Amino acid sequence: TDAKAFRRYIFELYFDPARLLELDDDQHLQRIERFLDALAPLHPVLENWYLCGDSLRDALSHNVTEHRQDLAKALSRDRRTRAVELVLWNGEEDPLKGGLSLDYEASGRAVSSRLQLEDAGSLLQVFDAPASSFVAIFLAVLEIWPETTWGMLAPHAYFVHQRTFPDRRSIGWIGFCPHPLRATDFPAATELVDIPGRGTLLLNGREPMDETRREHFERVGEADIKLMELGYLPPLRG
Amino acid sequence: LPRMGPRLPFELECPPSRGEMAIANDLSARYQQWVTNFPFPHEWFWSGTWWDGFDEPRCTLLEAKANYAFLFVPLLGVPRPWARAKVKSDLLQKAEVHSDKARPTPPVFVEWHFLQRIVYEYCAAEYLRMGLANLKAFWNPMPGTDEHDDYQETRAKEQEEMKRFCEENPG
Predict the structure, then answer these.
(1) Which residue of A has its CA nearest to B78?
(2) Distance (Å, rounded) from C-alpha A38 to C-alpha B54?
(3) Residue B78: which of A59, A119, A237 has the nearest Cβ?
(4) Which of A56, A94, A101 sits opposite B84 (nearest CB)?
(5) Which of B70, B72, B82 is most worth mutating to test chain A (most A CB atoms within 10 A of its CB)?
(6) N or C: less crowded end of chain B, CB within 10 Å?
(7) What is the 3-state secondary structure (H, E, C) of B47-58?
(8) B144 CB near a chain A CB, below 8 Å?
(9) Distance in angstroms (rounded) separating the CA atoms of residues A105 and A102
(10) Residues 61 to 80 of B: which have CB under 8 A from any A CB?
């Protein structure tokens, strides 16, 4: 449901920088194309994808889902340390209606080789069942990018100020851990989805996390502690 | 409790002094002159990197950013979706390359001074989640602007909030 004051959310997926760097311009563009195809059935705002622009009108000139040949136009290639960079947005201006953008950068550094969607909070406005729909996106990335080493869907307010280990990443509300995990070691309402030989998807509840109610806060904190205790919680810069 | 900005001197251990002034390729221009006291378009070129200003006494490199609020939704606190490419390359990437290009982190600090508040608010949070320890962000607006107005009354409402709290308590 559309609300007046919603929650900013980070939606990030990290990759192995070494392996992803060696993909050429052609392999990158098939990954993004498949990704947009997996997003399309989840909601009508995720069907179309437009290009970035200097103004609002300049950002609606080219539709990369209607004109597919124009997808190659949005891929950069640095001369020193080849680094591809791709930024789209879906075409909605208001986050309260689903305005969201796709930022896909792979330069070869661990911190700079990621994929993210600006303001996952816009998707919370449109998703009836946010849990099933967000898991779909995670499984899409893992299906398309085998180089994935991490993933985190968490409130921006939590992850910046309130997270348990400030020198580490977090699993967030829905995170990907590239290891086999044990349902015993986690809170009861925390449920796991093993990927054959790829890793585990954590879901700290099926209800969207909140940073003002203690029932949600302790659930991902215990989850983060067990991941650190097992040595699977990565640091920020790396 | 927004970060208090120091003042700036004039010009013409801390390595950046091994750089010099170069020419870079007018509300934005005025605000950088007000933050840096650097003449015309001169900027500090050190470590192969551009810096808007340089406080040699305080051993601090300076940068000024103005006119970037139209790229944001002023109440939700996020950039407009179509403007995510500009915010990345202009405000986030250039701020990482700056934190990366400082070596003696004890004496060499970097400061990013924003004319506009919602631009400061977004950047300050995004800089903390990036691991940018030696980069601090300031809402340091040049006078004769709506912002300077909301700046004066914000620090006034802090001394007011501090006036009541302090005289009724130990702290």
Answers:
(1) A119
(2) 48
(3) A119
(4) A101
(5) B82
(6) C
(7) CCEEECEEECCC
(8) no
(9) 10
(10) 73, 76-80
Place of tokens 């203690």: A214
Structure tokens at B88: 């990345």
Give the E-state strand segments of chain B in sequence order.
Answer: 20-23, 42-46, 49-51, 53-55, 60-65, 109-114, 135-139
- B97 touches A at CB < 8 Å: no
Are the beta carbons of A10 and A156 closer than 8 angstroms?
yes
Q: In chain A, where are the structural domains located?
A: 1-238
Q: How far apart are CA A235 and CA A163, in angstroms?
A: 13
DSSP letter, residue B79:
B
Contacts of B77 (CB under 8 A, 6+ apart): A8, B118, B121, B122
Crossing angle of the two packed helices A130-144 and A25-39, in degrees rounded to 10: 160
Query: DSSP string spanning chain A?
Result: ---SS---EEEEEEE-HHHHHT--HHHHHHHHHHHHHHHGGG-GGGT--EE--SSTTGGGS-BTTTSGGGGGGG----SSS--EEEEEE-S-S-GGGT--EEEEEE-SSTTT-EEEEE-HHHHHHH-SSHHHHHHHHHHHHHHH-TTEEEEEEEEHHIIIII-S-TTB---BSEEEESS---GGGS-TTEEEEEETTTEEEEEE-SSPP-SSSHHHHHHHHHHHHHHHHTT---BS--
Query: Which method resolved this structure?
Result: X-ray
Helix (H) or strand (E) holding B99: helix B94-100
User: Resolution in A, one decimal?
Assistant: 3.1
